[PDB]
């Protein structure tokens, strides 16, 4: 997280760390959506150009820092995830070997419903990004940054990559004052928003991709969780 700050203790209990088993290194952030399931970006597991095709025994999760390390049972990547062009449908589900014990430091986040959209996915409206990724282009504590959702045309015009409805972008425009972005190591983590309706946190996005970290005229692109809710529900049935 670039231009973020140290998070308070227990600020994001749904925070999951995706670690490489050997040699151990933080690969990606992820999120806790139930006592059993973890949500992350597809490209954190599957990106053929860089020779990347992670199995269940290549990785270990980290939850709560109180910290409960876990092995996964089954990985599910979207069948129409497009790594060739634009990272369309950059989404993947992790099933933990067994249910995790909830605590003051371990607690799942909510997936948005149609009403929660309508109400929150608007330009100017701020969301929360969190991770242990790089501060520039390593943190001691979990990092938090608040970044406003950006208009769809402004996202399209900020890049040459083809943007699909299955993605959205967020961040500040050049000379808006505040800065901030995700960076290498935050990818696959949650973009969360708080609902004024029920006082609950909802994950609207998955940190997907960007050109660099916290550059002017550029924005971080996030997977549209709600728009891929059907698929998330389908693999759990």
């Amino acid at each position: 997280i670039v231009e973020g700050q140290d998070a308070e203790v227990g600020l994001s209990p749904w925070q999951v760390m995706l670690f490489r088993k050997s040699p151990q290194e933080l690969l990606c952030g992820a999120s806790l959506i139930s006592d059993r399931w973890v949500l992350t970006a597809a490209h954190c597991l599957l990106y053929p150009p860089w020779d990347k095709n992670f199995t269940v025994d290549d990785l270990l999760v980290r939850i709560g820092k109180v910290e409960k390390i876990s092995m996964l049972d089954k990985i599910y990547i979207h069948p129409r995830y497009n790594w060739k062009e634009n990272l369309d449908r950059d989404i993947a589900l992790l099933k933990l070997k067994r249910p995790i014990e909830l605590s003051d430091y371990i607690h799942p986040v909510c997936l948005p419903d149609k009403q929660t959209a309508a109400k929150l996915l608007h330009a100017g409206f701020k969301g929360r990004v969190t991770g242990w990724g790089n501060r520039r282009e390593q943190p001691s504590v979990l990092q938090v940054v608040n970044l406003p959702l950006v208009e769809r045309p402004v996202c399209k015009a900020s890049t040459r990559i083809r943007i699909t409805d299955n993605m959205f972008c967020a961040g500040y425009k050049p000379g808006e004052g505040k800065r901030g972005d995700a960076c290498e190591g935050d990818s696959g983590g949650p973009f969360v928003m708080k609902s004024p309706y029920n006082n609950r946190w909802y994950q609207m996005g998955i940190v997907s991709w960007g050109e660099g970290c916290d550059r002017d005229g550029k924005y971080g692109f996030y997977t549209h969780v709600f728009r891929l809710k059907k698929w998330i529900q389908k693999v759990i049935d």
Partner: peptide, 29 residues
């Protein structure tokens, strides 16, 4: 999840984190 969204150290304690006001504020223009 029936209890999702509510943080044990925050929403369960009616304590609000240091940058919460920042978020809700953006909602009103």
């Amino acid at each position: 999840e029936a209890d999702c969204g509510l943080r044990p150290l925050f929403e369960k304690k009616q304590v609000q984190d240091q940058t919460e006001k920042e978020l809700f504020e953006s909602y009103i223009e």
